[PDB]
């Protein structure tokens, strides 16, 4: 994928930032791992991702992280090193799950423009 078809919602700093869940919960969703800090409640959350795109759709997810208005990371969808590969359907499965889990904790969740355009959104 040419840097032309690489979407980067997050900076290098954001991608690699260390973050700790106060009330960890994780889940393997097929070839993906979903992490949510359950201590996070009643907040507006924005999902941001870096992924490749082809034929007008997300092709391969590098990383997705959920940010609070203040810019703290409180959630994540990441590929499992072992499972080789994933589809956009895997990524969308994982996004619905992450959104559900965050809403369980009274959060309001939005996705980035690029996520909306390339994966999430009918």
């Amino acid at each position: 994928t040419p840097a032309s078809r690489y979407i980067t919602d997050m900076t290098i700093e954001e991608l690699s930032r260390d973050w700790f869940m106060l009330m960890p919960k994780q889940k393997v969703e097929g070839p993906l791992c979903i992490r949510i800090d359950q201590a996070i409640m009643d907040k507006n959350i924005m999902l941001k991702a870096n992924f490749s795109v082809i034929f007008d759709r997300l092709e391969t997810l590098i990383l997705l992280r959920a940010f609070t208005e203040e810019g703290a990371i409180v959630g994540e969808i990441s590929p499992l090193p072992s499972f080789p590969g994933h589809t956009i359907e895997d990524v969308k499965n994982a996004i619905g799950v992450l959104i559900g889990g965050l809403e369980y904790n009274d959060n309001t969740v939005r996705v980035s423009k690029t996520l909306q355009r390339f994966a999430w959104g009918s």
Side-chain angles (χ1 to χ4, degrees), residues 1-82 84-122:
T1 55
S4 168
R5 298 194 286 76
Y6 179 64
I7 298 316
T8 65
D9 291 350
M10 290 179 272
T11 56
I12 292 168
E13 183 282 319
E14 289 173 338
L15 277 174
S16 54
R17 188 190 303 163
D18 202 351
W19 69 292
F20 321 91
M21 301 177 279
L22 259 31
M23 197 172 318
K25 183 209 288 258
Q26 34 179 102
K27 185 195 184 179
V28 162
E29 182 87 2
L32 302 172
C33 172
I34 306 167
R35 295 170 166 100
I36 299 171
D37 188 352
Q38 318 217 81
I40 302 307
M41 305 174 317
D42 297 316
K43 288 193 146 64
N44 294 313
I45 304 302
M46 174 66 78
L47 305 191
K48 290 183 187 179
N50 294 25
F51 48 100
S52 71
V53 174
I54 201 187
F55 294 121
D56 204 43
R57 300 299 278 166
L58 183 151
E59 177 188 37
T60 299
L61 176 69
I62 298 292
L63 192 66
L64 179 157
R65 287 180 157 187
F67 291 78
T68 64
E69 285 191 335
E70 297 77 27
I73 298 163
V74 298
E76 180 178 76
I77 297 166
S78 57
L80 299 174
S82 299
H86 61 256
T87 65
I88 180 176
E89 279 78 18
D90 289 330
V91 172
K92 300 167 66 194
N93 285 348
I95 291 172
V97 161
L98 172 60
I99 289 173
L102 291 165
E103 282 164 357
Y104 182 75
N105 298 130
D106 287 325
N107 299 293
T108 298
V109 191
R110 271 142 43 84
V111 308
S112 74
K113 311 135 105 290
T114 48
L115 278 177
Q116 177 76 6
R117 170 63 160 85
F118 293 113
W120 191 258
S122 306

